[PDB]
Design a protein around this ligand. Structure first.
Ligand SMILES: Nc1ncnc2c1ncn2[C@@H]1O[C@H](COP(=O)(O)OP(=O)(O)OP(=O)(O)O)[C@@H](O)[C@H]1O
Ligand SMILES: Nc1ncnc2c1ncn2[C@@H]1O[C@H](COP(=O)(O)OP(=O)(O)OP(=O)(O)O)[C@@H](O)[C@H]1O
Ligand SMILES: [Mg+2]
Ligand SMILES: [Mg+2]
Lengths: 501, 173, 373
C-alpha cells in the first residue's frame, strides 16, 4: 500500500501516463515481482480502453505496491525512462527538497484549463466576478496555502447569515491559480445545511460517491441500512485514490459534520454561522470571520452593481447602508428590488423596511432565502432556551449603539452577579453573529439594524411592551462614545428610537 | 483496445453536458440556477445538441416525467439510491446500458426535475446533488460500453444533426 | 515521512481517532505501549484502561497507538478500533457485526456493506473464519460497558486493548489480564495541561488560589477541565474565578459545552454510570451526597449514613465507575471526590438530602460545608 506522497506522484504523472502508458506492457513484469496476481492483470487488461486500463492499473498499484520502485523500474525496463525519471524525481524532491517540489515538479505541469476542470468536477459554484472583497478572498487563499501541507485541518470562514462566506469561498478557490492543482490535488465541494439526525450521514454518503466518481458504480451499495463505521471505512478506502483533496463543507450547522470530518482526517474549509461548532475539533483550527461590509465597502458594492454615486442626496444613500447593516445578502436584496436608479424609489425601499421589516424588501436574488429573516430563523432555532429568550428582549434596544452591560442587564432576563448577561450576550454574537461586543475601554454589546429589523416582527409585540416598560422601571430605580456609569440614569438620549414604537 | 476517445477528452466531460442542460432547462422557466458550477470552456457544440434532443425528448416522451419527479421530490432529501430507483426506466424499457436514447432521456429528465426543484427553496440546494447523481449514473455506463458498441460524441453529433432536421421538418407539416 | 504516513493510514483504516498532541500524559501512554508490546505474542489478552468518565482513557489509547510504528507495524500487523458503549441485549451482536465488516476486503465491503440476518452464534463462526485472513490484529474496544463484549472477545481469542469505566467487566476474561488505571490529574499535571492549552499560568497567591480552586472543583478531570478551558473566554483569572463560582452554585452544568468529548458535561456521562448499578448501590451511593467531599471517611463514619454490608457495598462504587475511592493502610477509608459530589448534590432529589441530613446528626470540623446543604 502506498502513502499519500507516493500517490500524489502518480497523480502528478497522470498527464504523462495518458500520453504514452499502456498498462498491459507492465502486467507480466509486475506479476513477476509478485505485486500483481493474475487476477489483477485480467481486471486491468480486460478494460476496453487505455485510459480505462490506466485507471484500473492505478487503483491496484496503489493497493498492492508498497513503493514506487517497482513502477519506476518497470518504466526503465520498457524503455520509457522519461516516465520513470519523473516519478523518481518527484519522490526525490518530496523527500529531499520539498517546497521546491511544487515550484519545480508539480506547478510546471498545470493550466487554467486543468484548474477550471477540477472546479467543475469538484462541484464548485461559479465564481461571482462583479464585487470581489479582495481582503477576505486573499486571506482564505493565504491560509489555504500555508495549511496545505498539514495532514488534516479546519479553516473556518464564519459569519452572520449572508455575510458572504460562500461567495468568498468560491472566489478564493476560483481566483487563485495555485490552490486547486498545486497546493491541493483536487477539490470536493458539498453543501451541508443538515439539521436532522441522519443529515451528517447523508452528507458523507455523497462524499463517498464523490470520491468514487470514477469507479464502477454499477453496483454502488444502497446505504439505507449501513452503519456509520462502515460508511467511514468505505470513505477511507476510497481516499487512497484521492490524495490531497480539499473538502469544502458549505453551511455547516451541526457539530456532527466537524466530528466526522475530523475522524476522516480531512483537510477542510468550513463555512458556518456558529463558530462554536469548531469546539468539536481537536485538530488544528484556523479562522477568518466574514464581518459586515464597512461603510465605504457597501459603496463599492452598490457601485459595480449599478447604483449611482453622489447635498441631501447622499443622506438617502447613507440610510440604505445603515439599514442594510453591511450585510451583502440584504444589500443585494435591495438592488433587485429598486427598479429605478433614482435615490427616490431607493428611498421608497428604505422606508418600507422601516415600515414592514425586511419582508418588505423581499426578493429573488442569487441567495437561497426569500428574506434574510427566514435565514435568521434557523440561527434562532439552534440557540439554547435561555439565549433565545435573552435574544428576544434585545428587541427593546437602539440599533448601532455601544451600550454597556448594566444597561443591558435591565431588559435581558436571568458569589456572582449579572456577568451572566454578558455571557448570554457573548453567545448570541458567537452563535449567529446576532449581536457583537468590544473588550474596552469598557465591555459593551451592540445590535445591528437588520438584526433589529428581524427581532421586531418575531415576538408577540406583547413582549416588547412588557419589556420596554420594564426598562421604564429600571431607569427610575437608579454620540460616538460609551455612556459612563453616570449616564445609565437616562434612556432619553435615544428617545427618537426608544419611543418610536 | 484503444487510445483516447471522444468521451475521454476533458472538454467533453459528461458533467459539462449536465451542468449546461440543467442551467438551460432552468432558464426555460425564467429561473436561473446561480449555484451552477462554471463550465471550463463555455457551452460546447455537443452541449447545444443535447439541449435540442433534450427538448425533443421532453416533448415526445414526457410520459412519466411528472410521475417520476413526484417520487424523487417526495422526500426531505434526495439520494443516489432513490435516484437510481426512479431512473432505471427513463430512456429504455426491456440493450446497451447507455444508448444515445438513454443518455438523452436521463439528462432530459434530470433537467426537468432540476426546474421543479428550483421552484421551491426547500428542494433547491439539491439541484447540486441531482447534478452529481446524473453525471455518475451516465459516467459508469459509458465506461466499458461506448468503445465496444461503437458509440462516440462525434457519432451522436452526426445523429443529432439529422434528428434535429427531421424533427423541424415535421414541425411544419 | 513515509513511515509516518503509512502508520497514519493504518490508523485511519483502523478507525483510530486522531491522537491529541498538545498535551500528552506520557506515563500512562508509555505504560500502555510497553504492556501491549510485551503481550503482542500471546494468543489473546486484555489490557484494561479503566478510569472515571472522562479521565482520559480514550485519548491515551489513541496516543498509545499513534506514537510509533512499534505497536502497529512491528508488534501488530493491523488494528481495529470500535466504540462499543453497548447497553442493550442485541448490542453485543451489533458491535460484532461491525467487527465482521471491519474485517472484510474493500470490494467485499462494497458489495455487501451489511450482514445478512444470522444468529449471534453464526456471526461468531463468521468472525472466526474471517480472522485467519487477518493475523496479528490488535482490536480496541472503546467504552465497553457490558461484560458480554469481553466474553465474546475471549470466545474469539482476540488481542484487545479495552477502555472502560467499570473494572468488573474483566471477571469474564479467563486468560491474561493486565490493568492500567487512569487516575485524576495531579496538581502538577493539571498545570502542564492548562498550560499546554494557553491558559493563564498564575503569578502570586491570589491567582494561584483561583487556579487551584478550579483544579479542586474538577478533581483533576480532563474532560471537565477542557470544558472549563473552552468556557473561559476572556481567558483570564477574573473569568476563571467567575466560572469557579458558577460551578459551586449551579453544578457541573456551569461549564457545560461542546468539546472533543461526546457529552456536553460530565453530568450526562455519569448519569449512565449510575443507571448501571444494582438498585441497592444506585441508592447506596445516591446518599453519600450528604457528606464532606475530598475528606477521607472511614467505614465507621460511613456506616452512620449508608459495617461490612456497607464496607463493601461502597467498595463497589469505587470499582464500578470510580464514583468513590477506597483507601486502606492506615484505616480503610473511602473518600468521595468533589466532582462526584457536585454530581450528586444536584441530582439526588432535592429532598432525599434533607432526610439524609437529619438522620446524620447522631461533623463540625467541616462547618462551612455541612451548613451549605
Ligand atoms: N461579492 C458579492 N457579489 C454579489 N452578491 C454578493 C457578494 N457577496 C455576498 N453577496 C450576496 O450574499 C449572498 C451570497 O453570498 P453568501 O451565500 O456567501 O452569503 P453566506 O454567508 O454564505 O450565506 P449563509 O451564511 O446563510 O450561508 C447573496 O445575497 C449574494 O448576492
Ligand atoms: N491531552 C489530553 N488528554 C486527555 N484529555 C484531553 C486532552 N486534551 C483535551 N482532553 C479532554 O479530555 C476528555 C476526553 O478524554 P477521553 O475521551 O479519554 O475520556 P474517557 O476516559 O474516554 O471518557 P469515557 O470513559 O466517558 O469515554 C474531553 O473533555 C477532551 O476534550
Ligand atoms: Mg452560503
Ligand atoms: Mg471512550
Amino acid at each position: 500500500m502506498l502513502c499519500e506522497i507516493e500517490c500524489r506522484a502518480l497523480s502528478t504523472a497522470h498527464t504523462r501516463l495518458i500520453h504514452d502508458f499502456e498498462p498491459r506492457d507492465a502486467l507480466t513484469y509486475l506479476e513477476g515481482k509478485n505485486i500483481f496476481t493474475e487476477d489483477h492483470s485480467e481486471l486491468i487488461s480486460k478494460m476496453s480502453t487505455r485510459l480505462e486500463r490506466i485507471a484500473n492499473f492505478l487503483r491496484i498499484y496503489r493497493r498492492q505496491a508498497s513503493e514506487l520502485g517497482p513502477l519506476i523500474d518497470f518504466f526503465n525496463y520498457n524503455n520509457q525512462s522519461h516516465l520513470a525519471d519523473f516519478l523518481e524525481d518527484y519522490i526525490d524532491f518530496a523527500i529531499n527538497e520539498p517546497d521546491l517540489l511544487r515550484p519545480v515538479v508539480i506547478a510546471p505541469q498545470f493550466s487554467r484549463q486543468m484548474l477550471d476542470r477540477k472546479l467543475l468536477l469538484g462541484n464548485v459554484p461559479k465564481q461571482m466576478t462583479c464585487y470581489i472583497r479582495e481582503y477576505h478572498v486573499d486571506r482564505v487563499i493565504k491560509k489555504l496555502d500555508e495549511m496545505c501541507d498539514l495532514d488534516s485541518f479546519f479553516l473556518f470562514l464564519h459569519g452572520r447569515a449572508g455575510s458572504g462566506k460562500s461567495v468568498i469561498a468560491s472566489q478564493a478557490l476560483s481566483k487563485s491559480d495555485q490552490l486547486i492543482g498545486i497546493n491541493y490535488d483536487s477539490i470536493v465541494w458539498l453543501k451541508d445545511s443538515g439539521t436532522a439526525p441522519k443529515s451528517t450521514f447523508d452528507l458523507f454518503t455523497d462524499i463517498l460517491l464523490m470520491l468514487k466518481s470514477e469507479d464502477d458504480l454499477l453496483n454502488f451499495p444502497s446505504v439505507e441500512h449501513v452503519t456509520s463505521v462502515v460508511l467511514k471505512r468505505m470513505i477511507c478506502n476510497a481516499l487512497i485514490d484521492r490524495p490531497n483533496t480539499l473538502f469544502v463543507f458549505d453551511d455547516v450547522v451541526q457539530e456532527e459534520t466537524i466530528r466526522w470530518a475530523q475522524e476522516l482526517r480531512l483537510r477542510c474549509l468550513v463555512t458556518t454561522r456558529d463558530v462554536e461548532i469548531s469546539n468539536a475539533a481537536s485538530q488544528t483550527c484556523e479562522f477568518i470571520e466574514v464581518t459586515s461590509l464597512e461603510i465605504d465597502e457597501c459603496y463599492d458594492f452598490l457601485e459595480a452593481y449599478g447604483m449611482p454615486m453622489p447635498e441631501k442626496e447622499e443622506d438617502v444613500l447613507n440610510k440604505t447602508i445603515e439599514l442594510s447593516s453591511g450585510n451583502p445578502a440584504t444589500l443585494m436584496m435591495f438592488f433587485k428590488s429598486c427598479e429605478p436608479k433614482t435615490f427616490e424609489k431607493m428611498a421608497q425601499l428604505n422606508n418600507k423596511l422601516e415600515s414592514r421589516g425586511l419582508v418588505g424588501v423581499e426578493c429573488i436574488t442569487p441567495y437561497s432565502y426569500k428574506s434574510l429573516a427566514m435565514a435568521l430563523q434557523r440561527c434562532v432555532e439552534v440557540l439554547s432556551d435561555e439565549d433565545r429568550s435573552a435574544l428576544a428582549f434585545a428587541v427593546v434596544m437602539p440599533p448601532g449603539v455601544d451600550i454597556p452591560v448594566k444597561l443591558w442587564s435591565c431588559v435581558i432576563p436571568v458569589e456572582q452577579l449579572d456577568d451572566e448577561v454578558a455571557d448570554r450576550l457573548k453567545r448570541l454574537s458567537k452563535r449567529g453573529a446576532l449581536l457583537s461586543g468590544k473588550r474596552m475601554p469598557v465591555l459593551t454589546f451592540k445590535i445591528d439594524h437588520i438584526i433589529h429589523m428581524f427581532l421586531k416582527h418575531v415576538v408577540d409585540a406583547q413582549t416588547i411592551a412588557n419589556g420596554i416598560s420594564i426598562l421604564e422601571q429600571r431607569l427610575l430605580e437608579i454620540e460616538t462614545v460609551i455612556r459612563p456609569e453616570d449616564f445609565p440614569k437616562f434612556m432619553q438620549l435615544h428617545q427618537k428610537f426608544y419611543d418610536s414604537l | 483496445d484503444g487510445k483516447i476517445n471522444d468521451w475521454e477528452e476533458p472538454r467533453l466531460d459528461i458533467e459539462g453536458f449536465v451542468v449546461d442542460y440543467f442551467t438551460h432547462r432552468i432558464r426555460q422557466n425564467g429561473m436561473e440556477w446561480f449555484g451552477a458550477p462554471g463550465l471550463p470552456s463555455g457551452v460546447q457544440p455537443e452541449h447545444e445538441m443535447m439541449r435540442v434532443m433534450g427538448t425533443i425528448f421532453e416533448k415526445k416522451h414526457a410520459e412519466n416525467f411528472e410521475t417520476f419527479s413526484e417520487q424523487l421530490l417526495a422526500v426531505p432529501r434526495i439520494s443516489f439510491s432513490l435516484y437510481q430507483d426512479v431512473v432505471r426506466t427513463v430512456g429504455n424499457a426491456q440493450q446497451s446500458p447507455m444508448s444515445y436514447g438513454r443518455l438523452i432521456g436521463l439528462i432530459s429528465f434530470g433537467g426537468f426535475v432540476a426546474a421543479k426543484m428550483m421552484e421551491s427553496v426547500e428542494l433547491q440546494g439539491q439541484v447540486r446533488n441531482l447534478f452529481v447523481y446524473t453525471s455518475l449514473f451516465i459516467k459508469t455506463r459509458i465506461r466499458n460500453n461506448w468503445k465496444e458498441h461503437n458509440r462516440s460524441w462525434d457519432d451522436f453529433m452526426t445523429l443529432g444533426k439529422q434528428m434535429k432536421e427531421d424533427y423541424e421538418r415535421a414541425e411544419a407539416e
